[PDB]
Amino acid sequence: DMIKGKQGRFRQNLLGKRVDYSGRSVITVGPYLRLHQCGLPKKMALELFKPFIYGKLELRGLATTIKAAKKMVEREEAVVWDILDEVIREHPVLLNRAPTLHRLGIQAFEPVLIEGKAIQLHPLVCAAYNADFDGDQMAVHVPLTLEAQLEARALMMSTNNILSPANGEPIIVPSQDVVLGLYYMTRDCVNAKGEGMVLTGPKEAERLYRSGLASLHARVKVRITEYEKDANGELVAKTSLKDTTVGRAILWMIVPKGLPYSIVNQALGKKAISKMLNTCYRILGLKPTVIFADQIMYTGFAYAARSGASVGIDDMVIPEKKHEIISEAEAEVAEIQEQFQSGLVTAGERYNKVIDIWAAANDRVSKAMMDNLQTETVINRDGQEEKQVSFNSIYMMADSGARGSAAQIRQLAGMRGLMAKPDGSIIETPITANFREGLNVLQYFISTHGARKGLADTALKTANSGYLTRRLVDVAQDLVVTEDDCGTHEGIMMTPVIEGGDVKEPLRDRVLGRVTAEDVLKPGTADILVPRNTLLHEQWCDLLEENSVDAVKVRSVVSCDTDFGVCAHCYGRDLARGHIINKGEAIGVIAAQSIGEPGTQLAESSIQVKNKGS
Amino acid sequence: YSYTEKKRIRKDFGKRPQVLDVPYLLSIQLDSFQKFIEQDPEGQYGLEAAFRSVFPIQSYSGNSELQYVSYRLGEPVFDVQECQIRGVTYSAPLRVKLRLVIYEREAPEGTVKDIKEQEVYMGEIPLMTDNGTFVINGTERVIVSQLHRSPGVFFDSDKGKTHSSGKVLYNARIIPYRGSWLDFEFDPKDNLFVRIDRRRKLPATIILRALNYTTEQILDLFFEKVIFEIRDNKLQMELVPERLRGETASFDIEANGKVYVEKGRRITARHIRQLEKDDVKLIEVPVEYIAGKVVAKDYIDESTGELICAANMELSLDLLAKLSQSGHKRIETLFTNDLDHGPYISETLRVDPTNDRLSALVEIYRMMRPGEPPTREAAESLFENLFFSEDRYDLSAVGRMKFNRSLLREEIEGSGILSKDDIIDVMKKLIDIRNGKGEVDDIDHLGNRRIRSVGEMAENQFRVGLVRVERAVKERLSLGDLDTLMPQDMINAKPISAAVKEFFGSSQLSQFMDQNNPLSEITHKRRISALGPGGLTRERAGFEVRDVHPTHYGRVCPIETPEGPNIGLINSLSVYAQTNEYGFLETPYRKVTDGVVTDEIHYLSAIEEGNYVIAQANSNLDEEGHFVEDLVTCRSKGESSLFSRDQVDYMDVSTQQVVSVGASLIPFLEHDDANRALMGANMQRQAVPTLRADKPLVGTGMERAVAVDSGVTAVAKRGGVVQYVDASRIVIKVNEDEMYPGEAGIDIYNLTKYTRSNQNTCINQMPCVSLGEPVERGDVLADGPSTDLGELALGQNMRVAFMPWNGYNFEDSILVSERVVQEDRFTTIHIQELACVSRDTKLGPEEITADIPNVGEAALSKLDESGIVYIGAEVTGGDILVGKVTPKGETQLTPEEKLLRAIFGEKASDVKDSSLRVPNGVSGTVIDVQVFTRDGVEKDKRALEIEEMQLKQAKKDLSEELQILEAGLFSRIRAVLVAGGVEAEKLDKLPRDRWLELGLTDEEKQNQLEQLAEQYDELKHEFEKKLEAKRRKITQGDDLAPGVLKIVKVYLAVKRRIQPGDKMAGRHGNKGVISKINPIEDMPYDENGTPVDIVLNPLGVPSRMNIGQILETHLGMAAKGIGDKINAMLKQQQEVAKLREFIQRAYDLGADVRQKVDLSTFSDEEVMRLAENLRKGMPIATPVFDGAKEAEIKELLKLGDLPTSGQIRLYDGRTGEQFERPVTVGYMYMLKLNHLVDDKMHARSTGSYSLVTQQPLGGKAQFGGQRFGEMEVWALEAYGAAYTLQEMLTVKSDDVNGRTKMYKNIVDGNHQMEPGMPESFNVLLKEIRSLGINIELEDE
Ligand SMILES: [Mg+2]
Ligand SMILES: [Zn+2]
């Protein structure tokens, strides 16, 4: 029993040790921080770095011996705090959050001494940690040796890990407040103060906004000088007059040179911001992307605060024609039930009919609510009136992609649809009321059942996930990249998976960053498009898009020739960095983590061709 | 209204009139324990039942019977409060009357001797307090009720997972209250198998064999016969027409001269009707048809005797021929319809190896006791005691009721033991349902789940103690001599008290009271746990068990249950529910007389509820119980639909009866999603009492019920007038009505000040009333923790504004203004207890003296001569809490050295200190000290002060009562002295004590003066003896454990202020961590200049669909607006008239309201007082489902002269510029939860390491490091981080030389390392080598 088992050994004391120089505390927002830093309470920092303090105190000669250094720390004089500030300067610390699902559960930050007993965590990384500020705690370790310092700053630093190891897409995307602020900033209105005046640049736009002589969103013609690296790395300024809003210019102040103005010209929602970050990374590189993200955060918070967006009870308007629709559907259900009591239709048929008519009524009310709420701002220009995409705060929260989906909008202001009984069968009468109104005992009771089942599901799902990912990481641990290139020509012929109706996933994304098994020819023979095995980066993928290559044989890890591991070429590039895989990287563990962590949310008569083809 | 109610009335919205008032909330515990003790004649539930169950105890044929008469509960030696103070269990001695009777050894039976024992003492039984809890060692414990499967028989399906080929195999399980389990299951081959509790599955018929039934009897009892007659030729069969249902014809079915079914045509419905109307009984049949059947009985050759065919043998031509020639006209075959009627007992008999009774008993014995040769009587006794012994196997009265109901018998009362007819009917019902003429039971039905409360479990455990002691006494009375011993050497109290204290103390369901909130206590006491003994484990339990059954309606709360891993297994009980006579759950409903909705209420259980059509509570009734709508919405068999007015049988009592108390406390529940209500309630039960609780601006009205029913408030028992008010006691003069005629006196209530609760919170009571105020029975005298004037005030109500403020409320985090900490409104007091124990070692007892080796006089400065801290001293971490010395032995000093010691004064006995020190990093004030001395030659100095402090108070109380009685006696002495010669001039000016020595003319009057003098003496002498007794009880040593000389307890109290990192929450499931304290100037302010208190993120609303907070904010803004208006009108003091007009127009506010308030109070004073209490804002009461609609909120906002839309224009406190689009502001009632950052925060650099594996200690008391688990290792491996992981693995934890070398190297300002091999690996090597395995570290 002592050897075997969890409590006994290997798991507990030989894979699950208890390190020194470690702490734990509650996490907090701290918006003013830079992306690459973290707020650390004074007293814990002093306790951790005690021996460093003693060493430096003795080096400076302020204390003759170690006991005098201890006494000097226990008095806590100004000199001690100055030495602590000086030693902490470039020393990085490791932050960890209890369920380390993937490799982003441990990251390094530079600490900044602060008052208080709470750790301050940079907002952008919360998504990576799956961290929430509701009493979650985090542990903090200190790397001691020089190699540890170099490792923390090089491999683990926040700015070096912007791409998820699972897929190439960015992890640090703005979450909720930032996107709301930016959305508020970029949306335009038909008529406001300062409509159509011409500004020489963003600086006087800000002059106007801060002085209250012009609205933050108002259509205007501005002269702007964008830069484009179209030549072989030279930037060419093109300067012209565009018709935009004040807000988009204000945002434009931050934006680095390389990006087209068009990027900001639109509504700038969640998707738009994500692809903005993507383009900024692909064109300029890492450092501009980091600084641009920080600027975006700061400006979003500031102008979100200036907006003053709130939520009152009258902000969610019950559609006027709900009651009619419901009474009509009730009359229809009554007619179908009476026509059942005479016995011309089975019970199941009546069941199906009622469920379908109720679904139709739900769709009707939903569409009526969206029509009512969406475009209701009938504000007036000089003379006659006009209508435009409303500025209703709940509507902006829906449309921006900041919080909520159409389903939740329905759940707030419409009827909250059908429910499932324990066995999965659907109750005949739905919940016609919404949270703005009041439910009654039955409808509540039903929804209570729903929520209970949901919660229990999440619990068991988490347990099963954890277990599965543990097995996965266990099996694939020993696989290592041992050789540079095995030199095989073999590979798997990869096509775009066209499941039924259309192209669920295109080729270009499917092939990006894979080396080719053999040269592919244009649709006309002897027109080699790609030499023997080349790593397919974005430029090659776009080149393939310009042509009409359909299927590409690419070297796969399974067919790799290397003994006892894999070679760089057979694997490919994809990483948090962009380049070909480096020899030595443990791809087994990264693969297992990447597969495990997301695992917590888990008639036919005629064919009809959709597009004109052979 | 009552007086405390007249003090501050709460404006109640709500349209429907409350017909039933909330019952006593603690009914369960009190009623159950009352039923448990309950000295009663007729043996019902109660100790009496146990005694009669176990008694009479007869010797092993020794003819010495022992009889039981009755028992008596001794008077507790220690009252509740003093028992808690002194750290002993509050209990009563149990005394039982017994008789020993000895007969004549060799004569007709007749009592030779009967001796009656003088109420022998058989141990102590703990008593329950007034509130329904138990003090077990000076700690308050709660015994949670347990939900479990009721005894009886259940028929389950268990399909899907049966070999994954369908084959739904049914099973009947018989579970008794006391005894082994019985199980009947099927098999793919339709053989019905029995499996003793948890063994292999045998053929069922064996049990029928054990019951003494022969094969022919069984085949008679179970299968339906089929008759083949031979009349004049060829095999004619007696046929019941209705049997032909569904059968393709295999032969030509001719009958009575006419072919009916042609050979080959399947019998059609036309043919079936023809044959039925024709009344065909017998039909001739071809011999091929019979050439396949099976024989029922064992047909022997009656003439010669030789057997031919056996019972249940397949027929062959030779057997048919022998039968036909033997002369057998009537053949009985079996009916095996492979579709409906199967050969089940037949096939079981084929697999059944046993034939005779003896072989069956042998097989049973070889199942129960494998390996020992079975002897007949051993098997007989084993089998008898297994399932049919009254003592071992008992179902219940309830078990029997369920058993008879399952087999559809009208009779409820049966015999406990399992009779054979029972088993046969059970197997019949099982095979019947297997055919499909019956329904399976649902485990989740509350009709199948019974509640075992405290008294029942205590009774069971006590019975177990009795069976132990009975076997023991049995043996002792058998072996030992009969007539020598008296009935007290024979009975030992040790096992009874041992079993009872084991159950009460170390059990899963007996747990510490969750004592930080009144709500926490009250909800903890009314809990129903499915864990504990005979309960499912959480991991094993299926999702189906943890679902909410439609039966829970109005009995258990669907929404209040911990959201942790054991979600769904707790299910706090609803408000109005009660326990049945049998321990089931029943809920009230109002009767419906065909048209009128009457007022008589009936309590219905689950099954009874299932049948009827019950109307909803929120149905509109006008003045006579008539429905406004013609078709109303009801539920009849667990499904809702529309019924006509004159169809409803019952109607819900009130909207609240579905939900528990916790959910009923949340306002605007109707607008909150069930999930967020769940989390809100679960968290809200963790709130900590603040310094001065005030009240919720938005409540539900249930607050007074909860506060009163919990025992935290002080409530008047007999109404009277407040005589004396102090912040320690309230003294009341009783009213003459309730005043006892003989020896009444007055009532005195001593309050309890700051003591430590289980959760380390403060428990302080404040007086409400003032001198000379009249109080009535049931008013709130003193406020308990976090309650005001009778109302629950869990937290405090502050002005919130919903807006994002420079991303400081980014996520659920919360921003708070420095004004909140300045005003000191979220600061809580906590309380740690510390204990120093001085035991007796064999090298010598340790000492408490102040002479402590090599300590500076700084440490002694704060200690008195006795060695105890001064009361009121401020201490810090590391200071010596108390002084103790460890004895030192075998010093063997040289004589010159001894002389030196003598002159210097050095003590050989000491040289070591065991003195307790304040834990690291905790600093507070010593508020209290207690001393417990097991042996002590005399009371210690400190003991004397503490005894006098308690004593003087007790003395004061007795003196006060005595002084009142003396004043009365003196008044009466003056009234007698006035008779017999009036003397009022001289008397009143001479002292009162000079009235007994005075005289009067010799008459009966002199006799009366002597009477009153003797009464004066008697009152003095009774006072003195009661006082002496009380002082002897106080002084005596409180019995401590063996080996401990004495104990000193010290209480520290610490004031913790709110700071960044603490967790704060609302009532609707919104959470957050306080992120920053802003200066007053930065906070937003309205035009008027009032700043907001909390700035809360709006984005928490849409995805977390809790809309209750928005309505709460609006209504709270309305209430504070009215309160502001009343404060403004009151500061100028216009006149009573204006105030009355304004308050009346406010209190009315429309119509249809059940309020009826104002204008009955004294025209000026009581109105002025009520205005003073409401000037801070008028408290509202929105009930759960009969709540305030939007229009009413709009009206209330208008009455205050505020925007009806609930949004205001706001100015940015930092910049001064206006915010676009006005924002929602208003007051919300928020709570501070028990998760305080200073308790959570923790760090270590280097410290103590563990003994065996030289890793740093685990824990918080000792510094302790974080656990770098395998997942983190994997995380590091995903990176190329080899050196960090290496140092983390060896230098940081496990390498001893490595850690010291690294410490020195770091100190030197160099950063390298020397990894070495971890010590734990060496431990692993040593442990593997301890087996027979040689594992060596090779080298080359
Ligand atoms: Mg959290
Ligand atoms: Zn390869």
Short mmCIF file of N, CA, C and O in Angstrom, two decimals, chain B residues 972-1021:
data_model
loop_
_atom_site.label_atom_id
_atom_site.label_comp_id
_atom_site.label_asym_id
_atom_site.label_seq_id
_atom_site.Cartn_x
_atom_site.Cartn_y
_atom_site.Cartn_z
N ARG B 972 -46.32 43.64 54.05
CA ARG B 972 -47.35 42.85 54.72
C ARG B 972 -47.25 42.99 56.23
O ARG B 972 -48.27 43.01 56.94
N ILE B 973 -46.03 43.06 56.75
CA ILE B 973 -45.83 43.25 58.19
C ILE B 973 -46.36 44.61 58.62
O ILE B 973 -46.94 44.75 59.70
N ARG B 974 -46.20 45.63 57.78
CA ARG B 974 -46.78 46.92 58.13
C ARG B 974 -48.31 46.86 58.08
O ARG B 974 -48.98 47.45 58.93
N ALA B 975 -48.86 46.12 57.12
CA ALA B 975 -50.31 46.02 57.01
C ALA B 975 -50.92 45.23 58.17
O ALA B 975 -52.06 45.50 58.56
N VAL B 976 -50.19 44.27 58.73
CA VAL B 976 -50.69 43.60 59.93
C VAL B 976 -50.49 44.49 61.15
O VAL B 976 -51.34 44.53 62.05
N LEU B 977 -49.37 45.22 61.21
CA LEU B 977 -49.08 46.05 62.37
C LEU B 977 -50.09 47.19 62.48
O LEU B 977 -50.38 47.65 63.59
N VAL B 978 -50.64 47.64 61.35
CA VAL B 978 -51.65 48.69 61.41
C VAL B 978 -52.91 48.16 62.08
O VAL B 978 -53.61 48.90 62.78
N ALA B 979 -53.21 46.88 61.90
CA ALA B 979 -54.28 46.25 62.67
C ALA B 979 -53.79 45.94 64.08
O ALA B 979 -52.64 45.53 64.28
N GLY B 980 -54.66 46.16 65.05
CA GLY B 980 -54.31 45.95 66.44
C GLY B 980 -53.70 47.17 67.08
O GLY B 980 -52.88 47.04 68.00
N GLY B 981 -54.07 48.36 66.62
CA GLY B 981 -53.51 49.60 67.10
C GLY B 981 -52.73 50.25 65.99
O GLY B 981 -51.57 49.90 65.75
N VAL B 982 -53.35 51.20 65.28
CA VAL B 982 -52.69 51.82 64.14
C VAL B 982 -51.47 52.58 64.62
O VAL B 982 -51.54 53.39 65.56
N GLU B 983 -50.32 52.30 64.02
CA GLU B 983 -49.09 53.03 64.32
C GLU B 983 -48.39 53.39 63.01
O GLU B 983 -47.70 52.55 62.42
N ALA B 984 -48.59 54.62 62.55
CA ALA B 984 -47.99 55.08 61.30
C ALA B 984 -47.06 56.27 61.46
O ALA B 984 -46.15 56.43 60.64
N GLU B 985 -47.24 57.09 62.50
CA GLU B 985 -46.33 58.20 62.76
C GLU B 985 -44.96 57.72 63.26
O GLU B 985 -43.93 58.01 62.64
N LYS B 986 -44.94 56.99 64.37
CA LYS B 986 -43.67 56.54 64.96
C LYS B 986 -42.96 55.57 64.03
O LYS B 986 -41.73 55.61 63.90
N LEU B 987 -43.72 54.69 63.38
CA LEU B 987 -43.15 53.54 62.68
C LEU B 987 -42.30 53.99 61.49
O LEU B 987 -41.11 53.68 61.41
N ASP B 988 -42.91 54.72 60.55
CA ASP B 988 -42.23 55.10 59.32
C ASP B 988 -40.92 55.85 59.56
O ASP B 988 -40.06 55.84 58.67
N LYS B 989 -40.74 56.48 60.72
CA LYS B 989 -39.51 57.23 60.95
C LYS B 989 -38.45 56.42 61.68
O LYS B 989 -37.28 56.81 61.68
N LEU B 990 -38.83 55.30 62.29
CA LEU B 990 -37.83 54.41 62.85
C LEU B 990 -37.45 53.37 61.80
O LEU B 990 -38.24 53.09 60.89
N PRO B 991 -36.25 52.79 61.86
CA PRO B 991 -35.83 51.87 60.79
C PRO B 991 -36.77 50.68 60.66
O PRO B 991 -37.49 50.30 61.59
N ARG B 992 -36.72 50.05 59.48
CA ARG B 992 -37.63 48.95 59.19
C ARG B 992 -37.28 47.71 59.99
O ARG B 992 -38.16 47.01 60.52
N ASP B 993 -35.98 47.46 60.18
CA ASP B 993 -35.56 46.31 60.97
C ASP B 993 -36.06 46.41 62.40
O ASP B 993 -36.07 45.39 63.11
N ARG B 994 -36.47 47.59 62.84
CA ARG B 994 -37.09 47.75 64.15
C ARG B 994 -38.61 47.61 64.05
O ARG B 994 -39.38 48.42 64.58
N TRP B 995 -39.08 46.56 63.37
CA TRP B 995 -40.51 46.31 63.30
C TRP B 995 -40.84 44.90 63.78
O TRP B 995 -41.95 44.64 64.25
N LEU B 996 -39.88 43.98 63.68
CA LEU B 996 -40.08 42.65 64.26
C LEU B 996 -39.99 42.69 65.78
O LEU B 996 -40.78 42.04 66.47
N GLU B 997 -39.03 43.46 66.31
CA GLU B 997 -38.84 43.56 67.75
C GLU B 997 -39.96 44.34 68.43
O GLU B 997 -40.13 44.22 69.65
N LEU B 998 -40.73 45.12 67.68
CA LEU B 998 -41.86 45.81 68.27
C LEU B 998 -42.96 44.81 68.63
O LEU B 998 -42.98 43.67 68.17
N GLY B 999 -43.89 45.27 69.48
CA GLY B 999 -44.94 44.42 69.98
C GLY B 999 -46.32 45.01 69.76
O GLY B 999 -46.47 46.10 69.21
N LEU B 1000 -47.32 44.25 70.20
CA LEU B 1000 -48.72 44.58 70.01
C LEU B 1000 -49.49 43.89 71.12
O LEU B 1000 -48.95 43.04 71.84
N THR B 1001 -50.76 44.25 71.27
CA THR B 1001 -51.58 43.69 72.33
C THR B 1001 -51.81 42.20 72.09
O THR B 1001 -52.14 41.78 70.97
N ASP B 1002 -51.64 41.41 73.15
CA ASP B 1002 -51.70 39.95 73.05
C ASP B 1002 -53.05 39.47 72.52
O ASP B 1002 -54.07 39.56 73.21
N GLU B 1003 -53.03 38.92 71.31
CA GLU B 1003 -54.22 38.47 70.59
C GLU B 1003 -53.77 37.46 69.55
O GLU B 1003 -52.62 37.01 69.56
N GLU B 1004 -54.69 37.10 68.65
CA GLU B 1004 -54.29 36.33 67.47
C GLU B 1004 -53.27 37.11 66.66
O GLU B 1004 -52.43 36.52 65.96
N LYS B 1005 -53.36 38.44 66.70
CA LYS B 1005 -52.43 39.30 65.98
C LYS B 1005 -50.98 39.02 66.39
O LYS B 1005 -50.09 39.04 65.54
N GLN B 1006 -50.73 38.77 67.67
CA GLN B 1006 -49.37 38.43 68.09
C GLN B 1006 -48.94 37.11 67.46
O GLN B 1006 -47.77 36.95 67.07
N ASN B 1007 -49.88 36.18 67.31
CA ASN B 1007 -49.58 34.94 66.61
C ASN B 1007 -49.21 35.22 65.16
O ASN B 1007 -48.31 34.59 64.61
N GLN B 1008 -49.92 36.16 64.53
CA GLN B 1008 -49.61 36.51 63.15
C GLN B 1008 -48.24 37.18 63.03
O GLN B 1008 -47.50 36.92 62.08
N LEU B 1009 -47.89 38.05 63.98
CA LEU B 1009 -46.54 38.62 63.99
C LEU B 1009 -45.49 37.53 64.13
O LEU B 1009 -44.45 37.58 63.46
N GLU B 1010 -45.74 36.54 64.98
CA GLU B 1010 -44.80 35.43 65.12
C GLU B 1010 -44.72 34.64 63.82
O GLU B 1010 -43.63 34.22 63.40
N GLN B 1011 -45.87 34.41 63.18
CA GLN B 1011 -45.91 33.79 61.86
C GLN B 1011 -45.00 34.52 60.89
O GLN B 1011 -44.19 33.90 60.18
N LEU B 1012 -45.13 35.84 60.81
CA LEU B 1012 -44.39 36.58 59.80
C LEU B 1012 -42.90 36.62 60.13
O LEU B 1012 -42.06 36.59 59.23
N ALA B 1013 -42.56 36.67 61.42
CA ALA B 1013 -41.16 36.57 61.82
C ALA B 1013 -40.58 35.22 61.40
O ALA B 1013 -39.45 35.16 60.88
N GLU B 1014 -41.33 34.14 61.61
CA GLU B 1014 -40.82 32.83 61.22
C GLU B 1014 -40.73 32.73 59.71
O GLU B 1014 -39.85 32.06 59.18
N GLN B 1015 -41.62 33.42 58.99
CA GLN B 1015 -41.54 33.42 57.53
C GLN B 1015 -40.30 34.18 57.09
O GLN B 1015 -39.65 33.80 56.11
N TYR B 1016 -39.94 35.24 57.81
CA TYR B 1016 -38.73 35.98 57.49
C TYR B 1016 -37.52 35.09 57.67
O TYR B 1016 -36.63 35.02 56.80
N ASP B 1017 -37.47 34.38 58.80
CA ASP B 1017 -36.39 33.43 59.04
C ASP B 1017 -36.34 32.37 57.95
O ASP B 1017 -35.25 32.00 57.48
N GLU B 1018 -37.50 31.83 57.56
CA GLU B 1018 -37.54 30.79 56.54
C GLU B 1018 -37.05 31.29 55.19
O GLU B 1018 -36.31 30.57 54.50
N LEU B 1019 -37.45 32.49 54.78
CA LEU B 1019 -36.93 33.04 53.54
C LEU B 1019 -35.42 33.22 53.60
O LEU B 1019 -34.71 32.89 52.64
N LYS B 1020 -34.91 33.69 54.73
CA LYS B 1020 -33.46 33.83 54.85
C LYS B 1020 -32.77 32.47 54.72
O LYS B 1020 -31.78 32.33 53.99
N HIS B 1021 -33.27 31.47 55.44
CA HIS B 1021 -32.61 30.17 55.46
C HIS B 1021 -32.70 29.47 54.10
O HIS B 1021 -31.74 28.84 53.65
#
